[PDB]
């Protein structure tokens, strides 16, 4: 009992920048940074954006900031508390049967809006800040414009699908894969991020 260890907390380790018009990966925190704030929960860091890259000791994935929650898969986060600059927080919303997981959206943070337009013609954004087509085939898939390797896509659970206008329309969670080869993404609609809510 008395040596049992704790998991650490998901860390913010930089974001994917869409405020102009280039997206672009930024690291805000190296891996041995990474490593101790895990272990304490406590991240002094400045936080800016939407969509967040995030690390575990283990993986590292993309959390993303709709109504005010920062949202991401459960596959990567489990249970995890967030670091933040107080220390750790505890999820408010777990839900392993969607694989999804949300914290209370960090200070200054931006958050996405979900989108009402009804429209599917969708964006992916990637851990890479790769913007990729996506065409809706049905409440939580879609279809690449291009299919992709499945390397390509690995690592950016969690991240954005978006409309036109830039709405939140979903979290991508899983990659359709034949042969390696990604043709379509699953995603948790953003409408069951507002029933989680
Ligand atoms: C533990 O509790 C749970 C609860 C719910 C759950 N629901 C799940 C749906 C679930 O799927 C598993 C995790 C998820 C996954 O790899 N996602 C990410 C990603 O990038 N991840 S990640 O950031 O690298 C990481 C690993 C966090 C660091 C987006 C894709 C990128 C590349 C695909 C690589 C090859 C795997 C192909 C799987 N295709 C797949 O299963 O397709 C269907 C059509 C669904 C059969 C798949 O995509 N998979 C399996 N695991 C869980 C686990
Ligand atoms: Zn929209």
Same mark, same amino acid.
């Given at each position: 009992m008395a040596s049992m260890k704790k998991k650490g907390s998901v860390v913010i380790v930089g974001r994917i920048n869409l405020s102009g018009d280039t997206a672009y990966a930024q690291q805000t925190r190296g891996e041995e940074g990474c490593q101790e704030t895990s272990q304490t929960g406590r991240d002094k860091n400045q936080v800016e954006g939407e969509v967040q890259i995030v690390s575990t000791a283990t993986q590292t994935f993309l959390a993303t900031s709709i109504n005010g929650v920062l949202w991401t898969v459960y596959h990567g986060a489990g249970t995890r508390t967030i670091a933040s600059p107080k220390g750790p927080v505890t999820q408010m919303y777990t839900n392993v049967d969607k694989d999804l997981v949300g914290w209370?959206?960090?200070?200054g943070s931006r958050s996405l809006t979900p989108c009402?337009? /009804? +429209? #599917?013609?969708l964006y992916l954004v990637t851990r890479h800040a790769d913007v990729i087509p996506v065409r809706r085939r049905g409440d939580s898939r879609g279809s690449l414009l291009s299919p992709r390797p499945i390397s390509y896509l690995? /690592? +950016? #659970?969690?991240?954005p699908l978006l409309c036109p206008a830039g709405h939140a329309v979903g979290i991508f969670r899983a990659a359709v894969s034949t042969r390696g080869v990604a043709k379509a993404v699953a995603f948790i609609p953003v409408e069951s991020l507002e029933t989680t809510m």
């Open positions: 209370q959206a960090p200070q009402t337009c /009804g +429209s #599917s013609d690995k /690592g +950016s #659970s969690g991240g």
